[PDB]
Structure formats: structure tokens, C-alpha cells
Amino acid sequence: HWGYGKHNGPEHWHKDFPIAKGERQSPVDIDTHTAKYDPSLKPLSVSYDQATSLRILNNGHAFNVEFDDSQDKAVLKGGPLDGTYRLIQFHFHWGSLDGQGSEHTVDKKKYAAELHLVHWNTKYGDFGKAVQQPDGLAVLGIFLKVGSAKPGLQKVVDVLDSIKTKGKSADFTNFDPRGLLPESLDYWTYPGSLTTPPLLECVTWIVLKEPISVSSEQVLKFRKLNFNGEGEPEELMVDNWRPAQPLKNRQIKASFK
Ligand SMILES: NS(=O)(=O)c1ccc(NCc2ccco2)cc1
Ligand code: NA
Ligand code: NA
Ligand SMILES: [Zn+2]
Incomplete structure (x- = not known):
């Protein structure tokens, strides 16, 4: 029953x-x-x-x-x-x-x-075995800022109307994720975890320095999705992020000078 609301969000997950x-x-x-x-x-x-x-x-x-x-x-x-x-x-x-x-x-x-x-x-x-290991996963993280549209994102934006509520899915074949990358692959890296429950400590994080630009209209469509299922009171899918956590005994390394 975890989520991102006041009563089940990041401050409650530890229980x-x-x-x-x-x-x-x-x-x-x-x-x-x-x-x-x-x-x-x-x-x-x-x-x-x-x-x-x-x-x-x-x-x-x-x-x-x-x-x-x-x-x-x-x-x-x-x-x-x-x-x-x-x-x-x-x-x-x-x-x-x-x-x-x-x-x-x-x-x-x-x-x-x-x-x-x-x-x-x-x-x-398999993924399930990988999440029992401290080097099981690698997540490539890419920041989005609002400015010009990202052409390679538009196919994602345009299917969202068909998956408005929890549990809905749609065919999504032949999508090229290369269209979501920035020009540069310069990155920071550190050892971490999944950012949602079960919060498993399996991840080598690779966070790109260069953001991608998306348009206001593209991100506005993300914000029209729903956390709830069909027929339930509408809860807009927004603010589905976990805040920064303590760095503790870790080093963040840069790939670039
Ligand atoms: N936000 S994230 O990139 O750290 C991330 C990535 C993948 C999952 N997977 C969740 C899952 C299913 C079984 C075990 O775990 C959860 C979170
Ligand atoms: Na196969
Ligand atoms: Na350092
Ligand atoms: Zn994530």
C-alpha cells in the first residue's frame, strides 16, 4: 500500500x-x-x-x-x-x-x-536473482528540463491517454530509446538502491550530467495520468519522486574533468 501521498509516501516506507x-x-x-x-x-x-x-x-x-x-x-x-x-x-x-x-x-x-x-x-x-546482489542492477538516470520538445519522447506522450489509470497497458512495440538520450554521455556514478519499495541496495547509479529538454506540453501530459484505478476518485499522478537520502559512507565519481 505504499505510494506518494501524505499517508503512504516516502516518510512512511520504512515501516x-x-x-x-x-x-x-x-x-x-x-x-x-x-x-x-x-x-x-x-x-x-x-x-x-x-x-x-x-x-x-x-x-x-x-x-x-x-x-x-x-x-x-x-x-x-x-x-x-x-x-x-x-x-x-x-x-x-x-x-x-x-x-x-x-x-x-x-x-x-x-x-x-x-x-x-x-x-x-x-x-x-534473471532480474529477480539480480536484485539479491549488490551489483545486480545499473540504472541510467537522465534529467529533464522544460524548454524545447524532445522529438523522441512524443510517441510516449501520445499513448498516455490510453493508459490513464492503474493497471492499464497498451502495445508499445518499435520504440527506440536512443531518442531519449542527450548528446553527451558524461556522468556521475555511485552505489545506491531502488528509489521505490522494496528499496533494495542493488544499483550502480549512472546519472548523466547533460539534461534533455522536453516541452511544457509533453510534461503536462505526464501530469494527466492517474494513480488510481478506473472508476475510482481521480488522483493525478504527480510528485512521484523520493527526496534525496543521506550519502553516508559513499563517494560520487565523475567521468569527466
Ligand atoms: N526508480 S528505480 O529506477 O530505482 C526502480 C527500478 C526498478 C524497480 N523495480 C521494482 C521491483 C520489482 C521487483 C523487485 O523490485 C524499482 C525502482
Ligand atoms: Na527469446
Ligand atoms: Na568525493
Ligand atoms: Zn525510478
Whole structure:
């Protein structure tokens, strides 16, 4: 029964998910002046040309665009990662207004939204086994600011009317996630967690420095989705973000000088 409201939101999650107060929780504030350049990091290898999207689902928290991960197709390698991580889904977090919505912050700045491309380490065979491991997942995070439209996002925007309420899904084949990336792959990285329950501490976070621009109209359509199911009182799907958590004994590394 967790969610993002006053009575089931981030301040309550620890009661059913005590790892919420753990040692490597996400998101975090990225303090740009103390994140040290690491020359031992590698360029990120994002190989999405063979991605096979399947479906888009309103899960009552966000919407997920799901991929066929049954074989090595869309994969993330390099950067801080050892081995190969397979894309399973992407989703966003966003605000009720443009001045909030991101989960990570940069020198305390909140972006209007944040895209998470979720990948699992193929050495563990399946996503469920990967989330029992401290290096099971890699999430590529991309900030959204409001300005010019993002052409590669429009196909997502235009299907949202058909998945307004929790539990609705729609076919979403032949979507190219390369259209959601910025120009630069410069990034920050740190060890963290899922940002929603069960809050598992499995994630190598890779957060791109360059935001993507989306238009006001694109993000406004995100905000017309519903947390509730069909026939229930309308609760707009907005402010589905967790605030920054304590950094504790962690270092954020920069891939760029
Ligand atoms: N916001 S996020 O990128 O950290 C993220 C990514 C993936 C899941 N998955 C949730 C799940 C299902 C079974 C175990 O866990 C939850 C949150
Ligand atoms: Na540091
Ligand atoms: Na297959
Ligand atoms: Zn997320």
C-alpha cells in the first residue's frame, strides 16, 4: 500500500521496508564540487540499436515501457560497470510543477523530471536473482528540463491517454530509446538502491550530467495520468519522486574533468 501521498509516501516506507534507512539509499544530492574526476572510469557503452520494446503499463506509481530482455539486445556496458547489463524497462519521476520532480539533485537543484533506464547484470541470469546482489542492477538516470520538445519522447506522450489509470497497458512495440538520450554521455556514478519499495541496495547509479529538454506540453501530459484505478476518485499522478537520502559512507565519481 505504499505510494506518494501524505499517508503512504516516502516518510512512511520504512515501516514496511526498514532498508529505507539503510547505508546505500537513493536518490542523493550530487555535490558537483566534491564529486571527484576518476580517470579509471571508462566511457559508457550504450548499445540500444537492437532494443525490442513491447508494452507500456500504468502501475499506479509511474508508467513503465517494458523491453524483451530474454536475450542480449539492448545493453549497457563500460563506465563503472563490470560485464553486461540488459535493459528491462524505463520509467520517469516528475512533479506537479516544473520546479520539482527529479529524484537526484545537482547542487540541490531539482529538475522537472528524471528518466530511469533500468538494467540487470546478466551474470545473475534473471532480474529477480539480480536484485539479491549488490551489483545486480545499473540504472541510467537522465534529467529533464522544460524548454524545447524532445522529438523522441512524443510517441510516449501520445499513448498516455490510453493508459490513464492503474493497471492499464497498451502495445508499445518499435520504440527506440536512443531518442531519449542527450548528446553527451558524461556522468556521475555511485552505489545506491531502488528509489521505490522494496528499496533494495542493488544499483550502480549512472546519472548523466547533460539534461534533455522536453516541452511544457509533453510534461503536462505526464501530469494527466492517474494513480488510481478506473472508476475510482481521480488522483493525478504527480510528485512521484523520493527526496534525496543521506550519502553516508559513499563517494560520487565523475567521468569527466
Ligand atoms: N526508480 S528505480 O529506477 O530505482 C526502480 C527500478 C526498478 C524497480 N523495480 C521494482 C521491483 C520489482 C521487483 C523487485 O523490485 C524499482 C525502482
Ligand atoms: Na568525493
Ligand atoms: Na527469446
Ligand atoms: Zn525510478
